Chain A
């Protein structure tokens, strides 16, 4: 689960663009 990592740690632009194509 990446939802946990974006939540429990601080996410970034690149990390969020990786959840899309």
Chain B
């Protein structure tokens, strides 16, 4: 793993990678 600023799509990707199938859930952004 690489420590960086995570923001935008980098964040959701990092979460999909770190949590796997039990990834986070976000309602539709508007």
Question: Which parts of B1-30 form the interface with A (CB within 8 Å)?
Answer: 1, 3-8, 11, 14-15, 18-19, 22-24
Name, among B18, B22, B23, the residue most crowded by chain A CB atoms within 10 Å (CB to CB).
B18
Interface of B (DSSP majority class): loop
Instruction: State the B residues within 8 Å of A (CB).
Output: 1, 3-8, 11, 14-15, 18-19, 22-24
Tell whether, in the assembled complex, residue A20 and residue B5 are in contact, meaning their CB atoms are under 8 Å apart: no
Q: How large is the interface on A (under 10, 10 to 19, 20 to 34, 35 or more residues)?
A: 10 to 19
- A16 partner, pick from B7, B15, B22, beta carbons under 8 A: B15
B6 touching A17, Cβ below 8 Å: no
Contact between chains at A7 and B19 (CB < 8 Å): no
